[PDB]
Homo-oligomer: A and B are copies of this chain.
Amino acid sequence: LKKEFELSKLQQRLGREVEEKIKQTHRKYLLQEQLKIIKKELGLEKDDK
């Protein structure tokens, strides 16, 4: 049972790590996106066609 248990707990740590890395990715993307919107917001043509 423990032989199975060691792998399971390892997998649990690995799963939280991969998922938290995805969260650290996207949460920081929300922060950078907020940064952009504040850098853009001022009245401007908002470069485009």
Which residues of A does B touch, CB under 8 Å? 3, 6-7, 14, 18, 28, 30-35, 37-38, 41-42, 45-49
Given contacts A38-B42, A41-B38, contact A32 B48 (CB under 8 A): yes
> How many copies, total?
6
8 closest Cβ contacts across the A-B interface? A28-B47, A38-B42, A38-B38, A3-B33, A7-B37, A6-B30, A28-B46, A31-B41
- Closest beta carbon of chain B to A2's beta carbon, Å: 9
Query: Of all chain B residues, which has the CB nearest A48?
Result: B32
Docked-complex contact A47 and B32, CB < 8 angstroms: yes
- Closest beta carbon of chain B to A31's beta carbon, Å: 7
